[PDB]
């Protein structure tokens, strides 16, 4: 995802807020 949910949210849909980072299906893409 690259993005981070330091706040607890993600800007990229489909990506889960795995604080601090956003992961996608278990992948920091």
Task: Write a concise synopsis of the structure shown.
The protein is an all-beta fold and 29 residues long. It has no helices and 2 strands.
Characterization of this structure:
Belongs to the cyclotide family. Moebius subfamily. It is a single chain. This protein is mostly beta strands and 29 residues long. The chain has one domain. 0% of the residues lie in helices and 21% in strands. It is built from no helices and 2 strands. The chain has a two-stranded antiparallel sheet with strand order 1-2. A hairpin with a 2-residue loop joins strand 1 and strand 2. It is globular and about 20 Å long. The termini are close together.
What's the arrangement of secondary structure elements?
Layout: E1 16-18, E2 21-23
Tags for this model:
monomer; 29 residues; mainly beta; two-stranded antiparallel ribbon; 21% strand; plant protein; cyclotide; cyctine knot; divalent cation-binding site
Per DSSP E runs of 2 or more residues, the count of β-strands stands at: 2
Number of domains: 1
Instruction: Report the β-strand fraction as a percent range.
Output: 15-25%
**Distance between the ends:** 4 Å
Number of helices: 0
Secondary structural class = mainly beta
Largest sheet: 2 strands, antiparallel
Protein name: Kalata-B7
Family: Belongs to the cyclotide family. Moebius subfamily.
Cross-link (Cyclopeptide (Gly-Asn)): 26-25
Function: Probably participates in a plant defense mechanism. Has hemolytic activity.
